[PDB]
Amino acid sequence: GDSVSLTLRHINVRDTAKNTLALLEKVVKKTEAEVPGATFKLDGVEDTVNRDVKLKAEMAAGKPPQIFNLFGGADTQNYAKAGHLLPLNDILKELGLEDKFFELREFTVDGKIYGLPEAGFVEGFYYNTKLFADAGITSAPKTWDEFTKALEALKAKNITPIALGGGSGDGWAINMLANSLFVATAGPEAQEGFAKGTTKWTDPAVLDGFKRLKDLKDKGYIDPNVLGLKYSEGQAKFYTGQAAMLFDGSWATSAILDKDKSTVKDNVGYFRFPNIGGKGDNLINGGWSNGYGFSSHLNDAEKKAVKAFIKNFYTLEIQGEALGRDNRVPSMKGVPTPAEAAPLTKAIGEAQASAKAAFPAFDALVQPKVKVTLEQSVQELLGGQLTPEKLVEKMQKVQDEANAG
Numbered sequence: 587g588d589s590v591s592l593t594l595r596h597i598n599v600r601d602t603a604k605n606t607l608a609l610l611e612k613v614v615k616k617t618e619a620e621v622p623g624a625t626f627k628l629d630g631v632e633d634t635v636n637r638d639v640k641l642k643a644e645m646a647a648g649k650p651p652q653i654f655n656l657f658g659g660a661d662t663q664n665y666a667k668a669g670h671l672l673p674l675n676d677i678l679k680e681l682g683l684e685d686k687f688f689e690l691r692e693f694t695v696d697g698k699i700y701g702l703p704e705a706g707f708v709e710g711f712y713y714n715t716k717l718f719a720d721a722g723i724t725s726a727p728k729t730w731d732e733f734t735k736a737l738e739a740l741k742a743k744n745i746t747p748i749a750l751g752g753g754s755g756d757g758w759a760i761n762m763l764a765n766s767l768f769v770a771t772a773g774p775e776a777q778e779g780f781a782k783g784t785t786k787w788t789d790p791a792v793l794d795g796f797k798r799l800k801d802l803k804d805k806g807y808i809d810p811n812v813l814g815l816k817y818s819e820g821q822a823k824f825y826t827g828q829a830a831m832l833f834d835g836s837w838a839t840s841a842i843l844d845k846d847k848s849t850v851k852d853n854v855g856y857f858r859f860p861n862i863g864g865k866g867d868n869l870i871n872g873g874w875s876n877g878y879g880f881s882s883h884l885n886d887a888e889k890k891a892v893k894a895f896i897k898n899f900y901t902l903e904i905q906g907e908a909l910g911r912d913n914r915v916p917s918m919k920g921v922p923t924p925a926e927a928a929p930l931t932k933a934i935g936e937a938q939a940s941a942k943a944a945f946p947a948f949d950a951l952v953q954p955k956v957k958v959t960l961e962q963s964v965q966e967l968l969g970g971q972l973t974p975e976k977l978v979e980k981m982q983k984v985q986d987e988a989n990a991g
């Protein structure tokens with residue numbers, strides 16, 4: 587006691603996330619044993635629904651859950667400004683956690699920390715080394731010209747080159763590829779400038795990225811049924827051997843290595859987005875963007891339970907179990923290399939380590955309305971209802987509106 591009930595909003599709803607959910611449940615059970623009186627009510631919600639609908643609406647009402655999956659950057663800035671996020675600096679000092687994270691920048695607003703990343707990420711191309719060899723491609727492409735040559739060769743063998751599930755409410759999956767394209771063509775400063783008014787979506791180098799995205803679809807390099815598939819169905823297209831590569835975040839590794847379902851688990855490699863030439867060269871999309879935040883509206887009993895949860899979730903033993911089983915990338919420093927380290931994770935590590943630098947996802951840097959508009963727009967682009975030129979015009983219109991607000 588005191589008796590206290592806390593809702594814990596998480597996104598670990600899909601079958602492929604069952605190990606992540608079980609680890610969360612283990613931490614919750616430990617916390618309940620440590621804090622008599624405290625009961626956690628887990629509320630699992632699909633990724634897009636939580637971020638873009640449910641938590642958004644709860645925050646608008648000033649009634650978020652006590653604990654919730656949260657994104658750094660724009661989302662955290664909005665909710666912190668509105669006064670709905672618990673500042674964590676003193677808690678981190680109390681728990682010995684102040685210096686334990688690789689990077690808290692996305693969750694920091696005016697020096698105060700408003701969430702804790704659960705994992706790191708990079709985005710890049712997972713690829714099927716067998717299908718590449720079938721098409722005569724014997725190395726991972728380093729440059730755009732080598733990449734287009736590989737796509738040509740795969741297409742000529744009637745191998746679907748790029749898996750992608752971007753239908754329904756899953757436009758963000760298209761935006762993974764779009765974001766690396768427009769950073770490759772325009773440089774990382776372009777996406778930093780959209781919300782500051784110093785760059786525009788209509789800048790020719792940004793438009794160039796959307797022209798290339800459209801050309802990948804026009805050529806049949808992106809799966810023609812992209813708009814008919816959910817995100818996870820695009821992943822399955824890849825990890826069942828039905829397409830040669832997949833642009834995705836490193837949180838997808840476990841699905842690609844799954845012994846029950848992935849036929850590519852022993853024939854898979856990785857490469858970072860290839861060099862187009864210019865200020866985007868040798869960069870990799872990545873950072874520490876997603877984890878738990880906490881309501882600022884907690885009584886003393888609730889805050890004790892929340893502190894215990896933080897103590898029990900953010901520990902190297904939990905981070906190490908996540909890495910050892912699901913190849914989940916630590917957000918905390920000092921996790922030893924697993925004794926059986928996985929080749930695919932080694933390849934992702936090599937792509938990240940040899941990059942000049944990382945850049946965050948564009949949705950850390952633009953307002954939610956801008957993000958959702960891009961999702962709709964890229965679906966329309968791939969469906970032929972919007973040209974690249976009309977897309978960037980529509981995007982700058984919404985960006986101008988958001989910047990005025």
Ligand SMILES: CC(=O)N[C@@H]1[C@@H](O)[C@H](O[C@@H]2O[C@H](CO)[C@@H](O[C@@H]3O[C@H](CO)[C@@H](O)[C@H](O)[C@H]3NC(C)=O)[C@H](O)[C@H]2NC(C)=O)[C@@H](CO)O[C@H]1O
Nearest residue numbers: 602603606633634637704705758837838841875876947949
């Ligand atoms: C195979 C499997 O089920 N893996 C689970 C992971 O999906 C999950 O990681 C989270 O995945 C979501 C996507 O479903 C990631 O969200 C995306 O993150 C990028 C980068 O910040 C952002 O640009 C996208 O907008 C965002 N998409 C949406 C819809 O929000 C999220 O970052 C991942 N989070 C973490 C901590 O890695 C993990 C953990 O929940 O569990 C796996 O089992």
